[PDB]
Design a protein around this ligand. Structure first.
Ligand SMILES: CCCCCCCC/C=C\CCCCCCCC(=O)OC[C@H](COP(=O)(O)OCCN)OC(=O)CCCCCCC/C=C\CCCCCCCC
Ligand SMILES: CCCCCCCC/C=C\CCCCCCCC(=O)OC[C@H](COP(=O)(O)OCCN)OC(=O)CCCCCCC/C=C\CCCCCCCC
Ligand SMILES: CCCCCCCC/C=C\CCCCCCCC(=O)OC[C@H](COP(=O)(O)OCCN)OC(=O)CCCCCCC/C=C\CCCCCCCC
Ligand code: HEM
Ligand code: HEM
Ligand code: HEM
Ligand code: HEM
Ligand SMILES: CO/C=C(/C(=O)OC)c1ccccc1COc1nc2ccc(C)cc2nc1C(F)(F)F
Ligand SMILES: CO/C=C(/C(=O)OC)c1ccccc1COc1nc2ccc(C)cc2nc1C(F)(F)F
Ligand SMILES: CCCCCCCCO[C@@H]1O[C@H](CO)[C@@H](O)[C@H](O)[C@H]1O
Ligand code: FES
Lengths: 61, 80, 147, 295, 380, 379
C-alpha cells in the first residue's frame, strides 16, 4: 500500500512534503530532460551536427 | 471586513462532505456529459447563426474579389 | 518549470555570444623571435608576449632585489622560461608600457617613468604593482591560449 | 450536538436523536413499545448497581428473588454486537440570522470506551479546558484559549468533549459566540488543537493531570454518581475501574504522549462540523480543513 | 491587537483583504478568470520588457540591429523577444474577452470600475503602439508615420501637435528616443491604474452570471478562486506558448524584417491583429478628419455603455433577444477585423462601411431599444 | 456620508492623508523634509523623463547625446542642470530627514524607519547608475572601481561581477543595463514611499518633545500645507541660486572628458553625498574588509531602534546625548572631507580614526550615555 506509506512518510508533515517536492524535482529534471532530448534526437536521426560530426572530426585532410 | 454584514438569511440548511470523502470528477457519463450536451444545445442557435452569416459574407467577398482579377474574354473579341 | 525559466532569464544578463567571442586569444609562439617583444590586443588592452633570449633569464632573472615592490617571485605564478606573458597596462594610471626601451631592458611607461624589468616587474618609477600576468596555457605548445 | 451526530455518523444508527422523530411519536404502537422492552430490557444486558450503606450479600439476595426468569436457548444469553457506525468528515449548517448567538461544534472520530488512549485524550481536553463569561479567573485563566477568549472577547463560552461509545466516539469542542467573532474563535480554537499535536509542554500536562484527577474524584460525590459510575463501568469496561487504577493511568501521561495521541486522532483529519444560528462569518469547510494542519 | 497577524498587519491585511478572505460570488464562471490573467500578463510584459530594454539602443542607426543582436547573441534573447511580442497579443486576447464578459453580464453598471477599465484599454493601446516602433522595421516606421500623421487633420492645433510629437518634420530619431521612454513608462501607469481599478471594484464586489445578489452565497477567494484562476492560467498559457514556440512568425508582418526606409512605402500598411477592427473603421470614412473621429469614437463609445442600459435585469443570461444581438455584434467585429486586413478595393470598401455602420448602430440604437422591448415582454 | 470627501474611495484618500490628517500642533521645521523629499522625487522623475527622451544608451553616443541635449534641445541645459543638482538637493534633504529622526527618536516607529532605510539604499543605487549615463571619465572609473569591489566576496566573486557587467569590464552592455535600472528604480522609490507613509499613518507623527500629542492635534491643512509650501520655497532658493549661478560647483571636471579605459584619473572620488562612505571604505585596507565596513556604514541604520536605552523619546531633554549627537554630525563632516582627500598622511590616520569613532558613537557611546542618563534622573 504505497499510497498509505507515502502519505505517512512524505505527505503527512509539511516538512517532509517540501523535502519530497525538492528531491522529486531533482530526480524529475534529470529524467525528463534525458527522455526529452532522446525523443527529439531520435525523431531527427542523422540531421543534427552531433550525427554528421564524425565526417570532419579528425577524419579529414 | 465583508463577511458577516452581507445578508439577512433565515431557515436554510446546507450539507457538504470533506473533499477526501468524495470523488473529484464524479458521474462523467451519467451526469457530466449529458449536461454538457444540454448546455451546448441551448446555445448553438443563438451563437452559431451570426458566425455562420459571417463565414458566408467572408467567403463571398473573398471570391467576388478574386473574380474581378480574372479577365473577361469579351474585351478582346473585336481585336482581329 | 520555474527553475528553467528563471535560469534562462538570469542567463540573459551574462556575456552574450559576441562578447564571449573576444574572451580568449590564441597566440602562435612559433612566430616570435628571441628578445623581440610582440603586443596583441586582448580585451581592449594590450597583451605582451615576449620571447626571452639567453641574456634575459640570466641578466634579468638574477635581480638581487630584497623587498621587491610588488612581491613577484617567479616560481609563484609564471611558466615557460623564454616566454613571458603580460598585460600591457601600467598599474600606476593604466598607461601602456613600451617594450622598446625600458631603463631595465624590460618596459617603460612614458607617462610617469615606471620602468619595468624584462620580467614584467616595476623597478624605477611611480607604478605600485607589476604589469599583471593573465591566465593561459600551452595545450598546443606552438600555441598559447590567453583568456 | 444532535446535528453534529446526524452528520458525523450520517447514514447510520448513531445519526439519530434519542427522542426520535415526530412521525414515530405520532404512530408508535402499544405493540412496538412492548416489543422494545421485550427485545431490549434483558438480564445479560442489564446491571443492578447500588451505592451507599447496603450489604452486597443482602443485595444479591433480593436480586435472585425479584429478577426471576431464566433463559433456555443460547440466543437469550447472547449479547448482540452492533453494526459499526461509519464516520464522515462533513458539515451541516443551519442558518438563522434571527437567533442572538451562534453555536459551533467541531469534532473528529474518537476511539471508544475500551481504548487506553481515552485517558490521554481527556488529559488533552484538560489542557484546553473550558470557559464561560462568569469565570472569575478572567484574563489569568491557565487555559490559553480561555485567555484569548477573554482578551479578544471571542465567545460567551466554550467546552471540549470526549464523548465515548462502545466502538467509536467524538472528540471535539463547542462554543457560543456573537455573529461577528465566530471566525476568530474558530481560528484560535483550531490553533490550540494544533498546539496539542505539536508543542504541548510538561508544565501544561502536570496541571492537566491534576485537573483531571480532581475531576474523576468529583464524579464520585454522592451515592447517585457512584452508582452511575458502577452501572456504566460494568456495562462499558466489563468491570469497575477504581480511582486507584485511573490515577495510575493518568500519572503515566506526559507531554510526549499527549502530542503523539492527539496527532494520531487530530492531525490532518476531516472533521465533522455543525453550526447553528447567525453563522455567516464562519465559512468554507475547506478553510476549516486547512486548520487541521501546521502548528 | 488582532489574534492572527493577517488581519492586523498594515500590509498582510492588504494581501489578505483582496486575495485570501475576499468574499467572492460562489458562481462566477471562467469568464471571470480574465482579470487575474490580465494582471499576470502585465507583470509578465514588464519583466520581459526590462530584460529586452537592457540590450536595446534607441537610435535609428542601431535600433533594428540591437534587436537582431539580442535575438542572435543574448542568452535566450530570442525566447525573451518571442514571449514579449506574443505576450502583447495574449494581453489583447485577454482584454477583449474581459470586456466582452463585462458587456454581456452588465458589469459596466459598476461605473468607476468600468471607466477605469476603459482608461486601461487606451493606455494599453498607446503602449503597444509605441512599443511596435522600437524594432524600427518598415511597418514600425510606416505605421508610426501614417497614424501620427492623422493628427494634422485636427483644426489648427493639428499641424503643430504633430511636429511637436515627432520632434521634427517627419518620424525620425527624436521620435524614436521619445517613444522608447514612453513605452518604458506607460506600463507602470497601467499597473498604477490597475490598482485603482481593483479598489473601486472591491467597493461592490464581483458581479455574477445571473446578475442577482450573491450575498446569500459568498465564498473565500482562496482556495476557490486562487485554484480556479491558476488553472485558467495554464489553460490559456498552453496555446500562447504553443503558437509562440512552434509558429513564432504567425502573427507578425514580414515587412518588419526589413529596416525602415523613408523612400519606400510598403504596398499594404496594416497594424497587428488587435488594431485591425479599428483600422477598418478608420478607413471606412473617407475624409481625414471624419475618419479620425470615427476611430476615436470606436473606442470612446465604451464610456457610454453604462448609460444605454434599459433592461430591468442586469445580465443577458435571461434575455434571448439581447443575446443574439450581442453575438451579432461579436461577429460584426470579426468582419471589421477581416476588412482591416484587406486592401481598399471593392467589395471590401462597401462591406467595410456597412460593418462600421452596423457597429455603432447596434450599440447606440438596437441595444437600448431591444432592452426596452424586452421589459414589455415581461410585462414591466 | 454628507461630504463627498469622506465617502468617495479616492477623495477619501487624498483627504485622510493631506487634509483632515491629525498632526501634532508643535512639529518644527525639521518635519518639513518628508514633503520636500516627496516633491523632490516627483521632480527628479519629471526632469529625468525629459532627458531620457534625448538620450542614447550606447558608449559611442552617450557622452555626445547629453552634450547634444545641453547644446541643441530647447532648455535642455536647464533641464540637465535641475536633474543633476536635484539629485544633490534630494540628498541634502534626505540627510536632514534622517538626522531629525535620530535626534527625536522617530526610529521607534520601526516599520516607518526600516522602510526609510530601504528608500535610502534605493536612492543611492539610483544615483549610482544615473551617474554612469553621461559616460565621462569619472562615470567610467567610478563604475569600474566600485563594482569591482564585489569580486572580493570569496567564491562567487568574479562571478557576480562579470554577470553584473555583462562582460569582462565595464562596457556598453553595462551602460544599457544601467540606463534601464536608472529608469526603473525611481518608480520603486515612489512605490516604497507609499508604504513608508502608510506605516507612518498608523501611529501619526512624532513631535519635538516626544510626548503624546493627542491632547493637541491639528488638521494637516492649512497648518502644514502652508508650512510645507513655505519650507519648499525657502530651500528652493539656494538650490536654484547655486544651480543657476554656479552650475559646476559640485561637479567633477574630469567628467567633461569622454571616458577612456586606458587612462586612470589621478583622483577618483564620488559626488559629495557619497564621500563619507568612500572615506570609511578606504579606512580599512583589505578589499573585503573595506567592503564590509562600507556596507555596515549604511546598514547600521537598521540597528538604531535597538540601541535606544533612554526612558525619554527625544534628545530635547538629554544634554549629554545632544552633544554626543553633534559630535557625530561633526564626525561626518570629517569623514566627508577625508573622502575628498588623497590617500596619504595625515589623511589616512585621520580617516581611520573618524571611521572608528563613527561606529563607536553609535554602537557604544549612545546606548551607554542613555543608560547613564536614566540614573541621573533617578530611574
Ligand atoms: C529542478 C530544480 C530543483 C530545485 C527546486 C526547489 C523547489 C522548492 C519548492 C518548495 C516546495 C513547496 C513546499 C510547500 C508546501 C506547502 C503546501 O501546503 O503545498 C502548497 C499548496 C497545496 O495545498 P495542500 O494540497 O492542502 O497541501 C497540504 C499537505 N499537508 O498550494 C498549491 O496549490 C501548490 C500548487 C502550485 C501550482 C502553481 C503553478 C501555476 C503556474 C504555472 C507556470 C509555471 C511557473 C513559471 C515561473 C515564473 C517565474 C518568472
Ligand atoms: C475587438 C476585436 C475583435 C477581435 C476578435 C476577438 C475574438 C473573437 C472570438 C469569439 C469568442 C468565441 C467564444 C464562444 C463562446 C460560446 C458560449 O459558451 O456562448 C454561450 C454563453 C452562455 O452563457 P449564459 O447566457 O450566462 O448561460 C448560463 C447557463 N450555463 O455566453 C457566454 O459565455 C457569455 C459571453 C462572454 C464572452 C464574450 C467574448 C467575445 C469577445 C469579443 C469582444 C467584444 C467586445 C467589444 C470590444 C470593443 C473595443
Ligand atoms: C551624512 C553625510 C554628511 C554631509 C553633511 C550634512 C550637512 C551638515 C550640516 C550641519 C547641520 C547644521 C544645522 C544646525 C542646527 C542648529 C540647532 O538649531 O541645533 C539645536 C536644536 C535644538 O532643538 P531641541 O533640543 O528640540 O530644543 C527645542 C527648544 N526650542 O537641535 C535640532 O534642531 C535637532 C537636530 C536635527 C538636525 C540634524 C541635522 C544634521 C544632519 C546630519 C546627518 C546625520 C545623520 C547620519 C546619516 C548616516 C548615513
Ligand atoms: C490592465 C487591464 C485590466 C486589468 C489588469 C483588469 C483587472 C481586473 C480584475 C483582476 C478584475 C476582477 C476579476 C474579473 O472579473 O476578471 C476585474 C474586474 C472588472 N474589470 Fe478589469 N481589468 C482590466 C481592464 C478592464 C477593462 C478594459 C474593462 C472594461 C472597459 C474592465 C472592466 C472590469 C469590470 C467592469 C470588472 C467587474 C467584473 C465583474 O465582477 O462583473 N477591466 N478587472
Ligand atoms: C503593457 C506592457 C507592454 C506591452 C503591451 C508591450 C508591447 C510591446 C510591443 C508590441 C513591442 C513590439 C514587439 C515586436 O517586436 O513586434 C514591444 C517591444 C519592446 N518593448 Fe514592450 N511592451 C510592454 C512593456 C514593456 C516594458 C515594461 C518595457 C521596458 C522595461 C518594454 C520594452 C520593450 C522593448 C525593449 C522592445 C523592443 C524590442 C522588441 O521589439 O522586441 N516593453 N513591446
Ligand atoms: C524617498 C525618501 C523618503 C521620503 C519620500 C520620505 C517621506 C516621509 C514623509 C512625507 C514623512 C512625514 C513628514 C516628516 O516627518 O518629514 C516621513 C516621516 C518619516 N520618515 Fe521618511 N521619507 C524618506 C526617507 C526616509 C529615511 C531614509 C528615513 C530614515 C532611515 C525615514 C524615516 C522616517 C520616519 C522615522 C518618519 C517619522 C517622522 C516623525 O518623527 O514623525 N524616511 N518620511
Ligand atoms: C530618484 C530619482 C533620480 C535620481 C536620484 C537621479 C539622479 C541622476 C544622476 C546623479 C544623474 C547624473 C547627473 C550628471 O551628473 O550628469 C542622472 C542622470 C540621468 N538621469 Fe536621473 N535621476 C533620477 C531619476 C531619473 C528618472 C526617473 C529618469 C528617467 C525617466 C532619469 C534619467 C536620467 C538621464 C537620461 C540621465 C542622463 C543625462 C544626464 O547626465 O543629465 N533619472 N540622474
Ligand atoms: C507605430 O504603429 C504601430 C502599429 C501597431 O500595429 O502596433 C501594434 C500600426 C502599424 C500599421 C498601421 C497602423 C498601426 C497603428 O494603428 C492604430 N493604433 C492605435 C493606437 C492607439 C489607439 C487608441 C488607437 C489606434 N488605432 C489604430 C488603427 F489601427 F485604428 F489605425
Ligand atoms: C558609477 O559611480 C558613480 C559614483 C557617484 O558619485 O554617484 C553619484 C562614484 C564615483 C566615483 C567613486 C565612487 C562612486 C560611487 O561610490 C559609492 N556608491 C554607492 C552606491 C550605493 C551604495 C549603497 C553605497 C555606495 N558607496 C559608494 C562609496 F563612495 F562608498 F564608494
Ligand atoms: O499611505 C496612506 O495609507 C493610509 C492608510 O490606509 C491612507 O488613508 C492614505 O490615503 C495613503 O496615502
Ligand atoms: S601610468 Fe605608467 S608611470 Fe604613470
Amino acid at each position: 500500500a504505497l499510497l498509505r506509506q507515502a502519505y505517512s512518510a512524505l505527505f503527512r508533515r509539511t516538512s517532509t512534503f517540501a523535502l519530497t517536492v525538492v528531491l522529486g524535482a531533482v530526480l524529475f529534471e534529470r529524467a525528463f530532460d534525458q527522455g526529452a532530448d532522446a525523443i527529439f534526437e531520435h525523431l531527427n536521426e542523422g540531421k543534427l551536427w552531433k550525427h554528421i560530426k564524425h565526417k570532419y572530426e579528425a577524419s579529414e585532410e | 471586513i465583508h463577511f458577516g454584514n452581507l445578508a439577512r438569511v433565515r431557515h436554510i440548511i446546507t450539507y457538504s462532505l470533506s473533499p477526501f470523502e468524495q470523488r473529484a470528477i464524479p458521474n462523467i457519463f451519467s451526469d457530466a456529459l449529458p449536461n454538457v450536451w444540454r448546455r451546448f444545445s441551448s446555445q448553438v442557435f443563438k451563437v452559431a447563426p451570426p458566425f455562420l452569416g459571417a463565414y458566408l459574407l467572408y467567403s463571398w467577398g473573398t471570391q467576388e474579389f478574386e473574380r474581378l482579377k480574372r479577365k473577361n474574354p469579351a474585351d478582346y473579341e473585336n481585336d482581329q | 518549470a520555474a527553475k528553467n525559466v528563471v535560469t534562462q532569464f538570469i542567463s540573459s544578463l551574462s556575456a552574450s555570444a559576441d562578447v564571449l567571442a573576444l574572451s580568449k586569444i590564441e597566440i602562435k609562439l612559433s612566430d616570435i623571435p628571441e628578445g623581440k617583444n610582440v603586443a596583441f590586443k586582448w580585451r581592449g588592452k594590450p597583451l605582451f608576449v615576449r620571447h626571452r633570449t639567453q641574456a634575459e633569464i640570466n641578466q634579468e632573472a638574477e635581480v638581487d632585489v630584497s623587498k621587491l615592490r610588488d612581491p613577484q617571485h617567479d616560481l609563484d605564478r609564471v611558466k615557460k622560461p623564454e616566454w613571458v606573458i603580460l598585460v600591457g597596462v601600467c598599474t600606476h594610471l593604466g598607461c601602456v608600457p613600451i617594450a622598446n626601451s625600458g631603463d631595465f631592458g624590460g618596459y617603460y611607461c612614458p607617462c610617469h617613468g615606471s620602468h619595468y624589468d624584462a620580467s614584467g616587474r616595476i623597478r624605477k618609477g611611480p607604478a605600485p604593482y607589476n604589469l599583471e600576468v593573465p591566465t593561459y596555457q600551452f595545450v598546443g605548445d606552438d600555441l598559447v591560449v590567453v583568456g | 450536538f444532535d446535528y453534529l451526530h446526524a452528520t458525523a455518523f450520517q447514514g447510520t444508527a448513531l445519526a439519530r436523536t434519542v427522542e426520535g422523530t415526530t412521525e414515530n411519536i405520532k404512530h408508535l404502537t402499544r405493540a412496538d413499545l412492548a416489543s422494545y422492552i421485550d427485545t431490549h430490557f434483558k438480564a445479560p444486558r442489564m446491571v443492578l448497581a447500588a451505592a451507599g450503606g447496603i450489604s452486597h450479600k443482602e443485595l444479591v439476595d433480593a436480586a435472585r428473588q425479584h429478577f426471576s426468569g431464566v433463559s433456555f436457548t443460547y440466543k437469550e444469553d447472547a449479547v448482540p454486537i452492533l453494526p459499526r457506525c461509519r464516520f464522515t468528515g462533513s458539515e451541516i449548517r443551519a442558518r438563522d440570522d434571527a437567533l442572538p448567538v451562534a453555536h459551533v461544534a467541531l469534532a473528529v472520530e474518537g476511539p471508544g470506551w475500551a481504548d487506553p488512549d481515552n485517558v490521554v485524550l481527556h488529559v488533552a481536553n484538560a489542557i484546553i479546558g473550558r470557559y464561560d463569561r462568569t469565570f472569575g479567573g478572567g484574563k489569568h485563566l491557565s487555559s490559553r484559549l480561555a485567555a484569548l477568549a477573554v482578551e479578544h472577547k471571542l465567545c460567551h463560552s466554550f467546552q471540549t468533549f470526549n464523548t465515548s461509545y462502545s466502538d467509536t466516539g467524538l472528540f471535539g469542542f463547542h462554543f457560543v459566540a456573537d455573529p461577528l467573532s465566530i471566525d476568530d474563535m474558530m481560528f484560535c480554537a483550531q490553533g490550540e488543537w494544533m498546539r496539542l499535536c505539536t508543542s504541548t509542554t510538561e508544565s501544561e500536562v502536570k496541571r492537566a493531570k491534576n485537573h483531571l484527577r480532581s475531576a474523576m474524584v468529583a464524579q464520585l460525590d454522592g451515592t447517585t454518581p457512584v452508582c452511575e459510575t458502577i452501572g456504566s463501568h460494568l456495562l462499558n469496561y466489563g468491570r469497575r475501574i477504581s480511582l486507584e487504577e485511573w490515577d495510575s493511568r493518568i500519572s503515566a501521561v506526559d507531554a510526549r504522549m499527549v502530542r503523539d495521541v492527539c496527532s494520531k486522532y487530530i492531525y490532518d483529519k476531516c472533521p465533522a462540523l455543525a453550526a447553528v444560528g447567525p453563522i455567516e462569518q464562519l465559512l468554507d469547510y475547506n478553510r476549516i480543513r486547512s486548520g487541521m494542519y501546521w502548528i | 491587537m488582532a489574534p492572527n497577524i493577517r488581519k492586523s498587519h498594515p500590509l498582510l491585511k492588504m494581501i489578505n483583504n483582496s486575495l485570501i478572505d475576499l468574499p467572492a460570488p460562489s458562481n462566477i464562471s471562467a469568464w471571470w478568470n480574465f482579470g487575474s490573467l490580465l494582471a499576470v500578463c502585465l507583470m509578465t510584459q514588464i519583466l520581459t520588457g526590462l530584460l529586452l530594454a537592457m540590450h536595446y539602443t534607441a537610435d535609428t542607426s542601431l535600433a533594428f540591429s540591437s534587436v537582431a543582436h539580442t535575438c542572435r547573441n543574448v542568452q535566450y534573447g530570442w525566447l525573451i523577444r518571442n514571449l514579449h511580442a506574443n505576450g502583447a497579443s495574449f494581453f489583447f486576447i485577454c482584454i477583449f474577452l474581459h470586456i466582452g464578459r463585462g458587456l454581456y453580464y452588465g458589469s459596466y453598471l459598476y461605473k468607476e470600475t468600468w471607466n477605469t477599465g476603459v482608461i486601461l484599454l487606451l493606455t494599453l493601446m498607446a503602449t503597444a503602439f509605441v512599443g511596435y516602433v522600437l524594432p524600427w522595421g518598415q511597418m514600425s516606421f510606416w505605421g508610426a508615420t501614417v497614424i501620427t500623421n492623422l493628427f494634422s487633420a485636427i483644426p489648427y492645433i493639428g499641424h503643430t501637435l504633430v511636429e511637436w510629437a515627432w520632434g521634427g518634420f517627419s518620424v525620425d530619431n527624436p521620435t524614436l528616443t521619445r517613444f522608447f521612454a514612453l513605452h518604458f513608462l506607460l506600463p507602470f501607469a497601467i499597473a498604477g491604474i490597475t490598482i485603482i481599478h481593483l479598489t473601486f471594484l472591491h467597493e461592490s464586489g464581483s458581479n455574477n452570471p445571473l446578475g442577482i445578489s450573491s450575498d446569500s452565497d459568498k465564498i473565500p477567494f482562496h482556495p476557490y478562486y486562487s485554484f480556479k484562476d491558476i488553472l485558467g492560467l495554464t489553460l490559456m498559457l498552453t496555446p500562447f506558448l504553443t503558437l509562440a514556440l512552434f509558429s513564432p512568425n504567425l502573427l507578425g508582418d514580414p515587412e518588419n524584417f526589413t529596416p525602415a526606409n523613408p523612400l519606400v512605402t510598403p504596398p499594404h500598411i496594416k497594424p497587428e491583429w488587435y488594431f485591425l477592427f479599428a483600422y477598418a473603421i478608420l478607413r471606412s470614412i473617407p475624409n481625414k478628419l471624419g475618419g479620425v473621429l470615427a476611430l476615436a469614437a470606436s473606442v470612446l463609445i465604451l464610456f457610454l455603455i453604462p448609460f444605454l442600459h434599459k433592461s430591468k435585469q442586469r445580465t443577458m443570461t435571461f434575455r434571448p433577444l439581447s443575446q443574439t444581438l450581442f453575438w451579432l455584434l461579436v461577429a460584426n467585429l470579426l468582419i471589421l477585423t477581416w476588412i482591416g486586413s484587406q486592401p481598399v478595393e471593392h467589395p471590401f470598401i462597401i462591406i467595410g462601411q456597412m460593418a462600421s455602420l452596423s457597429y455603432f448602430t447596434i450599440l447606440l440604437i438596437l441595444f437600448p431599444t431591444i432592452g426596452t422591448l424586452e421589459n414589455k415582454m415581461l410585462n414591466y
